[PDB]
Nucleic acid binder design. Structure first.
Length: 1289
RNA sequence: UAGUAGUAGACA
């Protein structure tokens, strides 16, 4: 029952008025928002901005630090061991004690070396001992640390220490970016560093060994950068070891490279607590590598041997973890560059270019600083701005110059950027990081994108970014207040009319809309919607408006959701499930979406903003709203998603695989139109032939802006045609839109305390604080918060574009012009089809003059370059809404290259594969060797789906497997190696207990993660059924142990449980009650209880779950604790109700497997599991591959697809009335449930009990010739197994 | 110019 709301009567909007208004507007000269891309224009932009910048920032003469770690290598690097560490430490301490300190840090390292060298024999015993046999000592209290009492430090050492230990207005100093001397100095320094780094110190298997091993790995393995990366991994491992809670308060000393590099770790705050830095100094022999003498503390000299003493570096957990995997990040980035070069050129890169690219990537990976990240973020949009015909490149170059240049690395990057931009504006695409010229724009874009993705996502300052997050919302809310005070609330809320716009001509502005324009756009949409009213009505009514609100997953999710205003006045930070449980506990029914709206309509919309933690120059904020707000937004967005699904020009509603097909079809029809010839009819029967041409406009900032009035959507909804009989649902959506006009915007507690700590307040901070009356929340109007009404705004933009199309058609009926609009994501693509004269257009100018003199004054803007007038009118009509096209990030080009790059970047199924590739070595879910290995392997399969070559994907999966094996000590030679205890080979060992996880990327892509375990179990059954061998049966018992552990990602045969380090309604029900209820109600395992009475218990069960409680605490500095215990080989596994080490679990596994006996019940279970295990292996085993003489040709990107039971099983277990009704509500066809159950059990028998049923329970970017069958996708992958050669299957 | 960070006062 939808309640009776109020409707909106239509206004007498006439398209004739808009047509006449457009005739006058186009009767005068209209300036273009974009500038013609000339090399001279770009050069003068840079030259002017250089002088402006020199004025803007105070000059600094000392370039600042950029290298996070300084070191040098002269010989091949050998990985550090404990004995090697001891020997190198002694030798290095002798060398250091032979030197003479100069600065306080030199005295500090001299004191540390003296203290280390004078430790007793028992100190050295406990210093280099594992935690098993470690005993405490007067000097050594923690294994890898020692103590340095202040009495053992000189005055200079204490001076350095207190300098380390210990505003409202300032100007950040910058180097002289206009001086040529500064540029030359920076270029020389970075060139020297890079030349130092480049200095030399299955069918897929054979393809790798011929192509990726030859021209990439064999080249980079001997470079200085490779060994420097390994040494950096060792140093970072030592720093991570010292970051524990018990250890970080002490001193430490490590040496590497036969005593040539020495690490001195000072007492620090532990990295387990947030906002901490580890302090250290590196002392190294001067030589090639990561050396910047200008930013060194000293250079001690002893007989033609120079020792470089670095500054004290404070590195946080994020940057330390980034530095740990710098070598792998550089390797993946260079492999991506390798694949892209091969695709662009059809050849392999030469050795020098590969070495230089690897050195550049490694230097970027070492220097993890926010300024470089911001520069590389700017370059991504700067490159399209100079490769198009028109763009906003002056604004982009000014924005690039709006920063200080503090270090030599920044100035070198700026010099390169200026050179590349001027080269591009004068044209064939020069490389940013090489001497290679490309043939495709996508190659250069991918180069810069790979450079950008080398920086981690959390480099912003916490306080500064938290302050910056609220500024846009506050500023645009203030602008809205100013507008509604100048014009009155009614005009701003309800819009102005056309005659008011004709009288004022300044009402066309952001946050202001014309009512006639909104009604006309809705009519234009209805011109299409009316012809398909049946499907639209079915789509709307298929949103299930009468099902319970909280019985949907989205309404009981684990995402953040704001709660209530607290006594301090802040907005509570909560979870969706908590609010769901609270509402269920405070009422007795399960209301529907409309019923919840009725119950909560009176309350105010509330929202707070949190950091997204991205790697853009400015971090974006994510808005967290309350429950009634979510209900209102759900109503509006469900309605508009149902409506928007039937409009072709709206692309947000597309799934993601249809989006690419739709955009390809739009481009295809645009190309088809230009193949024709347009003719102009004349009275004298003398036609003029006009040549059709296309212009591509990639329009930025069309969907959302903090500068909009959500009140236009009310009239849009009122005038939009649906197939429903009445206006009840439409009135409900209009009312909900009315209920989100005003918002209570809360400032976060962090920023509140930040401002509170301040004594005086600057004018900008004062103006910001004035927005919040009580100091906690202020009111926002007009601007709906980001990411809340996407389909609504996208459809509104589509309607506006259609309105412009109709207006232009009415203005010029004598011209044959083509328009295609694609409002995808926040961007939009406009394709203007215009006509140019063929031969001098002698008749064309005469015709235009005749039109103008005949009274059609608006023909003046069509005389030459009519696409400019098209864009001018389109932009004006969009502004008649509240859509302002961004004049800096919009490019106008005659080719669809910049747009294609932007669109594929925006699409979630076509993001660059290097972004996912670099993410497979970081942020692994820290729980267990098997789960981490599966998470890492699955990320490399996703990269292959996104377009990674099988060789690059294989390289990345090998690197990730090596990293995971190092984390847990599984790899051969370390104590956690399973082959040390179990009497099987490493390849024959189950993955959950060590075991070779390394596999072909093809096996992982097709057969999935765990196929190694499946093959192991299948071969074990075959051996025990055909041979009954003793040691061959030994594998059988190991699997049975895992089930014993499991009973006491998915795992086919058990796992090993590891420790996990960690509510209001989580305790209202006793745990035994939850156990009894779950045992009684088994059908709810596959469905969600609907009725409130047991939905509450189901939700409390969902809260009291180790997996769920682990999920709510994912990103935390305490995650380092688990990896430290795993690296230190502590008691991290669970066995027989106790926490034991991995070696204990392996020993128990060996005992159980030795003492295993078959009962044929295990044999039946294993046979069932093997039967449950497309037969991808046989296809991969049986295939023919040969090299035909041809050249590899790369076509356009194409998206394909790679490939109810819970209702039936739930219906099987339903006993009482409530479970029975819930399974009928969930099931689509309750009539056929019994038949489906019968046929399923018949198939199970031909292939019953509850336990067996309980245990039984992809978009790919390819070329155009591939089909939608998984066999076609696999054959495409096999054909693309060679980078340069063509394979025939 | 101890580091990170920043033309919002931080870690401290």
């Amino acid at each position: 029952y939808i309640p009776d709301y109020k409707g909106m009567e239509p206004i007498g909007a006439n398209i004739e008025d808009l047509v006449d208004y457009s005739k006058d507007w186009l009767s005068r000269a209209r300036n273009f928002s974009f500038f013609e891309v000339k090399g001279t224009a770009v050069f003068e932009c840079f030259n002017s901005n250089e002088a402006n910048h020199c004025q803007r920032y105070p000059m600094s003469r000392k370039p600042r630090n950029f290298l996070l770690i300084q070191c040098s290598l002269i010989t091949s690097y050998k990985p550090a061991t404990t004995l090697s560490d001891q020997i190198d430490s002694r030798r290095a301490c002798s060398y250091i004690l032979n030197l003479i300190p100069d600065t306080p840090a030199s005295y500090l390292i001299h004191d540390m070396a003296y203290r280390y060298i004078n430790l007793t024999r028992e100190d050295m015993i406990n210093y280099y001992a594992p935690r098993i046999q470690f005993k405490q000592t007067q000097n050594v209290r923690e294994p890898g640390t020692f103590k340095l009492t202040s009495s053992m430090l000189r005055a200079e050492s204490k001076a350095m220490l207190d300098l380390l230990n210990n505003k409202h207005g300032a100007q950040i100093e910058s180097l002289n970016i206009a001086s040529h001397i500064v540029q030359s100095e920076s270029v020389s320094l970075i060139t020297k560093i890079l030349s130092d780094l480049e200095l030399n110190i299955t069918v897929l298997d054979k393809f790798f060994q011929n192509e990726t091993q030859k021209y990439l790995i064999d080249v980079l393995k001997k470079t200085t950068a490779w060994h420097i990366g390994h040494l950096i991994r060792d140093i970072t491992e030592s720093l991570i070891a010292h970051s524990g809670l018990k250890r970080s308060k002490y001193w430490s000393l490590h040496s590497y490279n036969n005593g040539n590099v020495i690490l001195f770790i000072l007492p620090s705050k532990s990295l387990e607590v947030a906002g901490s830095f580890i302090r250290f100094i590196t002392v190294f022999r001067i030589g090639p590598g990561l050396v910047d003498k200008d930013n060194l503390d000293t250079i001690l000299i002893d007989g033609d041997s120079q020792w470089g003493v670095s500054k004290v570096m404070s590195i946080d957990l994020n940057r330390l973890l980034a530095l740990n995997i710098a070598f792998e990040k550089a390797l993946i980035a260079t492999a991506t560059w390798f694949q892209y070069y091969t695709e662009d050129q059809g050849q392999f890169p030469l050795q020098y270019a590969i070495r230089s690219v690897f050195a550049n990537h490694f230097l970027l990976a070492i220097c993890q600083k926010m300024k470089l990240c911001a520069i590389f973020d700017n370059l991504r949009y700067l490159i399209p701005a100079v490769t198009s015909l028109y763009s906003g490149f002056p604004s982009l170059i000014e924005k690039l110059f709006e920063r200080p240049f503090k270090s030599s690395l920044e100035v070198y990057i700026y010099y390169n950027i200026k050179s590349l931009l001027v080269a591009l504006a004068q044209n064939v695409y020069p490389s940013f990081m090489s001497r290679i010229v490309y043939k495709h724009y996508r190659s250069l874009i991918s180069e810069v994108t790979t450079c950008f993705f080398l920086f981690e996502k959390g480099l912003h300052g916490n306080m500064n970014e938290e302050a910056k997050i609220h500024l846009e919302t506050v500023e645009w809310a203030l602008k809205f207040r100013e507008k509604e005070e100048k014009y009155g609330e009614s005009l701003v809320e309800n819009g102005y009319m056309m005659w008011e716009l004709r009288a004022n001509a300044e009402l066309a502005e952001q946050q202001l809309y014309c009512q006639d324009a909104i009604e006309l756009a809705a009519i234009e949409l209805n011109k299409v919607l009316a012809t398909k009213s049946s499907v639209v009505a079915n789509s709307i009514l298929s949103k299930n408006w009468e099902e319970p609100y909280f019985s949907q997953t989205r309404n009981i999710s684990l995402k953040g959701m704001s709660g209530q205003v607290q006594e301090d006045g802040h907005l509570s930070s909560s979870v969706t499930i908590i609010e769901a449980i609270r509402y269920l506990s405070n009422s007795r029914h399960n209301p529907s979406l409309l019923k919840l709206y009725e119950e909560t309509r009176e309350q105010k919309a509330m929202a707070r903003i949190v950091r997204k933690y991205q790697r853009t120059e400015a971090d974006r904020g994510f808005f967290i709203t309350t429950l009634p707000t979510r209900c209102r937004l759900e109503i509006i967005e469900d309605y508009y998603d149902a409506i928007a699904k039937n409009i072709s020009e709206e692309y947000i509603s597309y799934g993601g695989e249809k989006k690419i097909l739709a955009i390809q079809g739009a481009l295809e029809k645009a190309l088809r139109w230009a193949s024709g010839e347009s003719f102009i009819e004349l009275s004298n029967h003398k036609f003029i032939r006009m040549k059709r041409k296309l212009m591509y406009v990639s329009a930025d900032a069309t969907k959302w802006s903090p500068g909009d009035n959500s009140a236009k959507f009310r009239r849009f909804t009122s005038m939009l045609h649906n197939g429903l009989p009445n206006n009840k649902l439409k009135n409900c959506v209009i009312d909900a839109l009315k209920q989100v006009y005003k918002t209570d915007f809360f400032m976060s507690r962090k920023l509140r305390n930040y401002i509170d700590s301040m004594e005086s307040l600057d004018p900008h901070i004062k103006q910001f604080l004035d927005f919040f009356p009580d100091g906690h929340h202020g009111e926002v109007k007009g601007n709906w918060l980001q990411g809340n009404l996407n389909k609504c705004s996208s459809l509104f933009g589509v309607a506006m574009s259609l309105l412009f199309k109709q207006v232009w058609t009415n203005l010029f009926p004598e011209l044959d012009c083509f328009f295609e609009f694609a409002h995808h994501s926040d961007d939009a693509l406009f394709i203007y089809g215009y006509l140019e004269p063929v031969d001098d257009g002698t008749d064309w100018f005469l015709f235009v003059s005749q039109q103008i003199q005949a009274g059609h004054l608006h023909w003046f803007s069509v005389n030459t370059e009519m696409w400019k007038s098209m864009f001018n009118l389109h932009e004006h009509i969009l502004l008649l809404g509240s859509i302002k096209i961004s004049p800096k990030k919009t490019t106008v080009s005659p080719t669809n290259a910049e747009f294609l790059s932007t669109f594929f970047e925006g699409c979630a199924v076509s993001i660059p594969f290097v972004k996912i590739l670099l993410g497979s070595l970081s942020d692994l879910p820290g729980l267990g060797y098997f789960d981490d290995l599966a998470a890492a392997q699955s990320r490399c399969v996703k990269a292959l789906d996104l377009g990674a070559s099988p060789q690059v994907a294989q390289l990345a999966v090998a690197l990730c497997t090596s990293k995971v094996e190092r984390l847990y000590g599984t790899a051969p030679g370390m104590v956690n190696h399973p082959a040390a205890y179990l009497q099987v080979k490493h390849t024959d060992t189950p993955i959950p207990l060590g075991g070779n996880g390394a596999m072909s990327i093809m096996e992982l892509a097709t057969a999935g993660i765990g196929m190694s375990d499946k093959n192991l179990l299948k071969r074990a059954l075959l051996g025990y059924s055909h041979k009954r061998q003793k040691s061959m049966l030994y594998i059988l018992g190991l699997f049975k142990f895992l089930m014993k552990l499991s009973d006491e990602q998915f795992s086919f045969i058990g796992k090993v449980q590891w420790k996990i380090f960690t509510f209001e309604f989580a305790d209202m029900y006793t745990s035994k009650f939850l156990e009894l209820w779950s045992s009684q109600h088994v059908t709810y395992d596959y469905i969600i209880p609907k009725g409130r009475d047991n939905l509450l218990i189901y939700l409390v069960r969902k809260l009291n779950d180790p997996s769920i409680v682990t999920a709510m605490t994912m990103q935390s500095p305490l995650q380092l604790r688990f990896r430290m215990q795993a690296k230190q080989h502590m008691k991290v596994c669970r066995l027989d109700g106790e926490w034991v080490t991995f070696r204990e679990v392996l020993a128990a596994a060996n005992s159980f497997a030795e003492n295993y006996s078959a009962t044929s019940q295990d044999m039946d279970l294993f046979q069932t599991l093997t039967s449950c295990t497309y037969a991808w292996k046989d296809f991969l085993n049986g295939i023919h591959c040969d090299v035909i003489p041809t050249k590899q040709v790369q076509r356009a990107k194409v998206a394909r697809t790679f490939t109810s039971i819970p209702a039936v099983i739930g219906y099987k277990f339903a006993v009482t009335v409530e479970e029975m009704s819930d399974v009928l509500d969930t099931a689509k066809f309750p009539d056929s449930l019994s038949v489906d159950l019968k046929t399923m059990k018949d198939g199970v028998y031909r292939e019953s009990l509850p336990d067996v049923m309980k245990r039984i329970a992809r978009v790919v970017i390819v070329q155009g010739n591939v089909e939608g069958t998984a066999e076609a996708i696999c054959r495409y992958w096999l054909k693309s197994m060679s980078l340069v050669k063509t394979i025939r299957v």
